[PDB]
C-alpha cells in the first residue's frame, strides 16, 4: 500500500511524530495552550527540529501535503486525547514563520513544487476580497435527486466537477451548508535589494486562503512562508490543447558584526565622522560639502552633482526611489489610479512614494510639478500618509517616508532641505574643481551598517541635557531681525535627531544639537536674501 504519485508509505513516519509531540519537551507548554485556551494553527520556524529526527524531518518539504494532514491529524490524535473537554473544535493547521532558506523563487526550479517555501519579497497588492466556490451537489433526473458532487466527500475540487446546476450550490449552498470557499490572491514582489540590476525579480501569484486572509497588506515587508502550486495552461478552456507551462500559484501557509561594530565603535569613538564621513560622502565632488552633510542626516544647473548625489543616495540605499516630474507626474510617486485592463477593474495605482514609506524620496524637477499634482505634496508632507478615497479601495496610504529633491511656492516651509547651487565665479575654484577631475582623470558597506544599527537600535532623547537648548535656540534663531517658533524647532529636533541617531548615543547635548544650528542657519542663510 503506497501513494506512488508522491511516494508516501501508509503513514510512513507517523508513529515517530506522535511520540515527537510528547518527546519534543526540551511543545509541552504549548501542547495544552492550543486545546485549553483554544488557539490552534501551529506556527513553526525554519524547522530547526532537525536535531531531533531526520526521517520525520527530510519529509517536511518533501511530499508533505500528505503529511501536514497526518500532522493536523496526529497532533489532533494526541491533542484530542490531551484535553477532549475543552474547545476541541479548533482544528490545527500549521503556519511556519521565517521558514527554510528559500532559493529566491526567482531561481526555484520548474521542479520545485511540492515544496514548503518562504518569500524574500515585497507586496505589490492584495486580492481584496475574492474568495471562491466550496462544494457541490447537482440535480440529476429520477424525479431529480439533488446529487452531492463535491458535497460528496472523497471527490475533488476540480474544474468541471461543478459544471451544472448553479443554484444547487448558489442557493443550496446556503440551504445545504457548503457556504462558498475561500482563497486570497496577492501580487508580491521578490526583491533582494541589491539585485544584479538590470534583470528583475519575480512577482507572485499568491492565492491561498486561510483566515490569515488580509493579514498581509500591500506594500508589506516579508516574513512569509508558503507552498507552491501550479496548473497547466490550456490553449483555451474551450479546448484541451496545451500550453506546456503550469500556472504557478502558491499555498500561503505563513504565520563578524560585533567586530564590525567594534570598528564602528572606533568610528563611533571617532569625533569628526560628521566631517570624515562628509569627507567620504558624495566624494565625487569638491565643495558644497555642506550640502553633502544632511544626506547623512537625512539618511538618519541640471544634474550638476545632483542626481549623482541622489543617485549616491539611490546607490547607497535600498530604501528609496528616484524619480522626477515632467515626464513622471505624481503617478510615478502615487495616485496613478488605474485598472487591470485584462480584468477591467481599478487598482490602487501609485508609485515611488508607495515605494518610499520609511524611505527617502529622490524627486527631481520639483519646479515642473503641476497643481493637479504637487497638491499631493501639499498634503503628503503635512501627513506622511496619503488619503486615497477611490473606487475599489478607499483608504489612506502611510508614506511615513523621507524626501529630497531640487529644482533649478509658499510651502518651502515643509521641506527637509535643499540648497543653492550658485556660481562661485572663481577660476581658481574651477581649477580646484578641475583639479578634482583632472586628479580624477567599503566605507559604503561600513556606512551601510553604520546607518543601520541606529535604524536598528538607537533612539535619541533630547532631555534637560539640551532640551533647554532648543528653547535657548529658536529664541536665538527667531530673534535675529525680529521664523523659528514655527516647526523649525520640530525641524531642529529632526536635525538634532540625527547626531544621537549617530554615535549610538540615545541622549543628546548642545553639541549634537548645536551642529544643526549651523545647518539650519547656513541653510537659512544660503536660502536667505
Amino acid at each position: 500500500l503506497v501513494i506512488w504519485g508522491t511516494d508516501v508509505n501508509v503513514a510512513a513516519c507517523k508513529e515517530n511524530f506522535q511520540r515527537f509531540l510528547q518527546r519534543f519537551i526540551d511543545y509541552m507548554q504549548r501542547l495544552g495552550e492550543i486545546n485549553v485556551i483554544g488557539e490552534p494553527f501551529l506556527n513553526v520556524n525554519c524547522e530547526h527540529i532537525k536535531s531531533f529526527d531526520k526521517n520525520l524531518y527530510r519529509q517536511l518539504i518533501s511530499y508533505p501535503q500528505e503529511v501536514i494532514p497526518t500532522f493536523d491529524m496526529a497532533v489532533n490524535e494526541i491533542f484530542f486525547d490531551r484535553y477532549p473537554d475543552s474547545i476541541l473544535e479548533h482544528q490545527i493547521q500549521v503556519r511556519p514563520f521565517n521558514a527554510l532558506k528559500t532559493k529566491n523563487m526567482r531561481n526555484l526550479n520548474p521542479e520545485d513544487i511540492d515544496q514548503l517555501i518562504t518569500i524574500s519579497g515585497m507586496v505589490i497588492r492584495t486580492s481584496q476580497l475574492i474568495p471562491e466556490m466550496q462544494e457541490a451537489f447537482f440535480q440529476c433526473q429520477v424525479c431529480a435527486h439533488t446529487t452531492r458532487v463535491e458535497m460528496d466527500r472523497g471527490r475533488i475540487a476540480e474544474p468541471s466537477v461543478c459544471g451544472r446546476c448553479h443554484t444547487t450550490h448558489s442557493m443550496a449552498l446556503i440551504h445545504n451548508r457548503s457556504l462558498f470557499s475561500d482563497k486570497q490572491m496577492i501580487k508580491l514582489q521578490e526583491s533582494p535589494e541589491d539585485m544584479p540590476a538590470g534583470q528583475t525579480p519575480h512577482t507572485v501569484i499568491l492565492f491561498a486562503h486561510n483566515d490569515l486572509v488580509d493579514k498581509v497588506q500591500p506594500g508589506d515587508r516579508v516574513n512569509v512562508t508558503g507552498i507552491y502550486r501550479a496548473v497547466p495552461i490550456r490553449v483555451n478552456p474551450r479546448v484541451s490543447n496545451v500550453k506546456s507551462v503550469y500556472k504557478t500559484h502558491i499555498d500561503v501557509i505563513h504565520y563578524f558584526s560585533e567586530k564590525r561594530v567594534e570598528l564602528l565603535k572606533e568610528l563611533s569613538r571617532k569625533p569628526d565622522i560628521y566631517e570624515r564621513l562628509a569627507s567620504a560622502l558624495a566624494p565625487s565632488i569638491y565643495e558644497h560639502e555642506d550640502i553633502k552633510k544632511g544626506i547623512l542626516l537625512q539618511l538618519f544647473d541640471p544634474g550638476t552633482s545632483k542626481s549623482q548625489l541622489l543617485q549616491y543616495v539611490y546607490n547607497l540605499v535600498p530604501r528609496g526611489q528616484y524619480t522626477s516630474g515632467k515626464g513622471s507626474s505624481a503617478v510615478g510617486l502615487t495616485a496613478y489610479v488605474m485598472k487591470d485592463p485584462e480584468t477591467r477593474q481599478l487598482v490602487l495605482q501609485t508609485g515611488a512614494l508607495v515605494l518610499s514609506d520609511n524611505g527617502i524620496c529622490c524627486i527631481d524637477e520639483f519646479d515642473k510639478m503641476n497643481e493637479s499634482t504637487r497638491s499631493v505634496l501639499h498634503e503628503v508632507m503635512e501627513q506622511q500618509t496619503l488619503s486615497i478615497a477611490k473606487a475599489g479601495i478607499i483608504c489612506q496610504l502611510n508614506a511615513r517616508t523621507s524626501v529630497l529633491a531640487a529644482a533649478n511656492h509658499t510651502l518651502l516651509s515643509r521641506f527637509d532641505l535643499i540648497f543653492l547651487l550658485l556660481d562661485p565665479q572663481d577660476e581658481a575654484y574651477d581649477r580646484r574643481l578641475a583639479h578634482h577631475l583632472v586628479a580624477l582623470y567599503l566605507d559604503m558597506a561600513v556606512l551601510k551598517d553604520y546607518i543601520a544599527y541606529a535604524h536598528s537600535t538607537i533612539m535619541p532623547r533630547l532631555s534637560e541635557e539640551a532640551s533647554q537648548a532648543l528653547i535657548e535656540a529658536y529664541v536665538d534663531m527667531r530673534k535675529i531681525g525680529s521664523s523659528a517658533y514655527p516647526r523649525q524647532l520640530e525641524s531642529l529636533i529632526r536635525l538634532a535627531e540625527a547626531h544621537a541617531k549617530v554615535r549610538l548615543s540615545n541622549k543628546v547635548e548642545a553639541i549634537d544639537v548645536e551642529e544643526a544650528k549651523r545647518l539650519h542657519r547656513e541653510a537659512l542663510k544660503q536660502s536667505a536674501t
Binding site: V2, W4, G5, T6, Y63, N109, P110, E111, I113, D114, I124, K187, A197, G198, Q199, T200, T203, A230, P232, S244, V245, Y246, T248, D301, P302, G303, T304, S307, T323, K326, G327, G332, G351, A352, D423, Q425, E427, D430, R431, L433, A434, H435, L437, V438, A439, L440, Y441
Partner: protein
C-alpha cells in the same frame, strides 16, 4: 550508418570519458560525469573538436545529422549513468541533466538570413545582436501522467486521465531575438533578426544588444517523433540556441605607410566626399567615428559618449550623412523624431505567439549598446522621447518601473542628432529655444552643438555649384587628389585607434585647466548665450581623449588640447 551503430557511440561514449587523463585520471568529459551523477554540474557542453582528432565520425556525422547524433549522444548518456552513478524513461532519465555542444569552426556563427532549407536538421551556430527578452517560465517536457488503476509513474510527452508534475520532466525556457550585427549588412536590405528558441541554464543569462554566441541546435530528446525525419504534421525548426555566449571581445604605417600622416588632416579629405566642405564638423564626426568607448582604468565611463547635436535639416542635405555615418558606423542605427514611439530607441512589451511571454524588445538605443546613435528631427521626439534621452545622458539608462518589469538596459551608445529648427529656419535674432525649441537643458548636455547656416556666400555657393555640377560629371567629389578608402578599412583604420586607451601626461594637468580656466573665464566673462559646464571639461578632455586615438600617442598631447580648444574656438558660434 546512423540508425544501427548505437553500440559504437555507446562504446565510443563508453571510452571517450576514458580517452584521456585530463579529468584527473579520467577525461575532462568524464570529469563532469562524476560531477553529473553527484549533481554538481547538470547541463553539459561538448567541444566536438576533441572527437575529430581521433574520429571525425560523430563530428562530420553530427554535422550531417545533428538530431540523430544529438539524440544518440543522449541515449548513450541515458544508459551511461550506472557506470558513473553514485547510487520508457525511468524518472531520473537526464531529467534535470542537460547536454549542449561546441567545437571547431566547421560551425561558424552564421547569418540570420543564411538559415535555410539546408539548415533543417543542421548543426548550427550564430552570432549577432540580441533582443526580445521574454519572461522566463519553467516548462514541462514530459507528461508524467497517471495510470490510476495501475499505480506507479507513467510518462507521455502528451481523458479521464490526469497529467501530474511529480515525475514530469521540465525546463526553464525563453524566447530571444538575435539580430544582424549592423556590420555584415553594407546593403540595401533590412538587418535581419530571428525568432530564437531558448532554454536551459542559458535562460536568465543575458540582455539585448550583445554580440554573442549561439548554437541554434536541436535537442537530443527526440529525433522526429516515433520515426525518421519524414512526417505529416510538424512545427518549426527555429533557433534552438545552445551555448549562447557573449562577445566581450572577438594596415600599419610600420609595415605600410598609412597612419603616419594626420587622419585629422587626411581623413577629412577622404571622408564626406559629396559634402561641401565644412569638414570641421566632420572632425567630431571623425571623433565619434572614433568614439571614446575603450577606456583606460581612470573611471572615465562618460568617455564613450560623443553626444553631438546638429541644428537645422536641409543643411546641405545633412539629412544624408547620417546614412553616410551609418555607412561608416557599425553598431549604429538611425531614427527620426516622429517616425515611431520611444521604442524606436527604448523598449516595450506585449504577448507573442511562438514562444516566450511578453518579450521586451527595444529600440535603437536598446540596440545601441555603445553604438552610434543617429537621429532625425530631435525636436519631434516629444516629451516621452525627450526623456530616456535625458536619462541616456547617463549611460545604461533604459530604466523600467512597470508592474512586471522594472529593469534598466545598457543604453551605452553615443548620440549625433539632427533637429529641425523651431517652425522656421535659424535666425540670429531668435535664440535657441526660439529658433530651436528643444530644451537648452538637453542641448546643454550635448558634447557639442553645431549649425550649418544655409547662407548667401555666393562664391561658396558658386563652389557648391561647382561642387554639384562636378556631380553627374562623375563621382569625383574630392578631385583634389584624395584616395577615398573602404569604410571597413577605415574601420580598421578606426579600430587601432580605439584600442589605444590613452591616458594623459599628468604634467598636462595644468594645460587643460590652464586653458579651461581662461576658456570658461572668457565665456562667463563675455556673458553671451554660450554656456558651458564641467561636462565641458569632460568633453574637452573627452575630445582630446579621442584625438590622441588617431594621433596614436597612447597618452595625450598639447596639440589635442590646443585642437580641442580650436574645436571649441571653432565651436564658438558654431551656432
Amino acid at each position: 550508418d546512423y540508425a544501427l551503430e548505437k553500440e559504437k557511440v555507446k562504446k565510443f561514449l563508453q571510452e571517450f570519458y576514458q580517452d584521456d587523463e585530463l579529468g584527473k585520471k579520467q577525461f575532462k568529459y568524464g570529469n563532469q560525469l562524476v560531477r553529473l551523477a553527484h549533481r554538481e554540474q547538470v547541463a553539459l557542453y561538448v567541444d566536438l573538436d576533441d572527437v575529430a582528432e581521433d574520429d571525425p565520425e560523430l563530428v562530420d556525422s553530427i554535422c550531417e545529422n545533428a538530431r540523430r547524433y544529438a539524440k544518440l549522444f543522449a541515449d548513450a548518456v541515458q544508459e551511461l549513468l550506472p557506470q558513473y552513478k553514485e547510487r520508457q524513461y525511468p524518472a531520473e532519465l537526464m531529467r534535470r541533466f542537460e547536454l549542449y555542444f561546441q567545437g571547431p569552426s566547421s560551425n561558424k556563427p552564421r547569418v540570420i538570413r543564411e538559415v535555410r532549407a539546408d539548415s533543417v536538421g543542421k548543426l548550427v551556430t550564430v552570432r549577432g545582436i540580441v533582443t526580445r527578452v521574454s519572461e522566463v517560465k519553467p516548462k514541462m517536457v514530459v507528461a508524467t501522467y497517471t495510470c490510476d488503476q495501475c499505480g506507479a509513474e507513467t510518462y507521455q510527452p502528451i481523458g479521464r486521465l490526469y497529467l501530474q508534475t511529480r515525475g514530469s520532466r521540465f525546463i526553464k525556457f525563453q524566447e530571444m531575438k538575435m539580430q544582424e550585427h549592423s556590420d555584415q549588412v553594407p546593403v540595401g536590405n533590412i538587418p535581419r533578426s530571428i525568432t530564437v528558441l531558448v532554454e536551459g541554464e542559458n535562460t536568465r543569462i543575458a540582455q539585448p544588444g550583445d554580440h554573442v554566441s549561439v548554437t541554434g541546435i536541436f535537442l537530443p530528446i527526440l529525433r522526429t517523433g516515433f520515426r525518421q525525419v519524414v512526417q505529416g504534421l510538424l512545427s518549426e525548426t527555429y533557433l534552438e540556441a545552445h551555448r549562447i555566449v557573449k562577445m566581450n571581445k572577438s594596415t600599419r604605417e610600420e609595415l605600410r605607410q598609412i597612419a603616419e600622416e594626420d587622419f585629422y588632416e587626411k581623413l577629412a579629405a577622404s571622408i564626406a566626399p559629396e559634402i561641401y566642405g565644412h569638414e570641421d564638423v566632420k572632425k567630431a564626426l571623425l571623433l565619434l567615428l572614433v568614439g571614446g568607448v575603450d577606456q583606460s582604468p581612470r573611471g572615465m565611463k562618460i568617455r564613450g559618449n560623443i553626444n553631438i547635436c546638429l541644428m537645422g535639416d536641409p543643411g546641405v542635405a545633412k539629412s544624408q550623412l547620417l546614412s553616410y555615418i551609418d555607412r561608416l558606423a557599425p553598431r549604429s542605427q538611425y531614427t527620426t523624431g516622429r517616425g515611431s514611439s520611444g521604442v524606436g530607441l527604448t523598449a516595450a512589451v506585449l504577448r507573442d505567439s511562438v514562444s516566450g511571454e511578453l518579450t521586451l524588445e527595444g529600440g535603437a538605443l536598446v540596440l545601441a549598446d555603445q553604438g552610434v546613435c543617429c537621429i532625425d528631427e530631435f525636436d519631434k521626439m516629444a516629451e516621452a522621447d525627450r526623456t530616456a534621452i535625458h536619462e541616456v545622458m547617463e549611460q545604461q539608462t533604459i530604466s523600467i518601473a512597470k508592474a512586471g518589469i522594472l529593469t534598466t538596459l545598457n543604453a551605452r551608445c553615443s548620440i549625433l542628432a539632427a533637429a529641425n529648427p523651431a517652425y522656421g529656419r535659424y535666425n540670429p535674432r531668435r535664440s535657441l529655444e526660439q529658433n530651436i525649441q528643444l530644451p537648452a537643458a538637453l542641448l546643454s548636455r550635448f558634447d557639442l552643438l553645431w549649425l550649418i547656416q544655409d547662407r548667401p556666400d555666393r562664391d561658396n555657393d558658386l563652389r557648391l555649384a561647382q561642387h554639384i555640377t562636378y556631380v553627374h560629371q562623375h563621382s569625383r567629389q574630392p578631385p583634389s587628389q584624395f584616395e577615398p578608402l573602404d569604410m571597413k578599412l577605415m574601420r580598421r583604420y578606426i579600430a587601432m585607434c580605439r584600442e589605444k586607451q590613452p591616458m594623459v601626461p599628468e604634467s598636462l594637468a595644468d594645460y587643460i585647466t590652464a586653458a579651461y580656466v581662461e576658456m570658461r573665464r572668457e565665456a562667463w566673462a563675455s556673458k553671451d548665450a554660450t554656456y558651458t559646464s564641467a561636462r565641458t571639461l569632460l568633453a574637452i578632455l573627452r575630445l582630446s581623449t579621442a584625438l590622441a586615438r588617431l594621433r596614436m600617442v597612447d597618452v595625450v598631447e598639447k596639440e589635442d588640447v590646443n585642437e580641442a580648444i580650436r574645436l571649441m574656438e571653432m565651436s564658438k558660434d558654431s551656432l
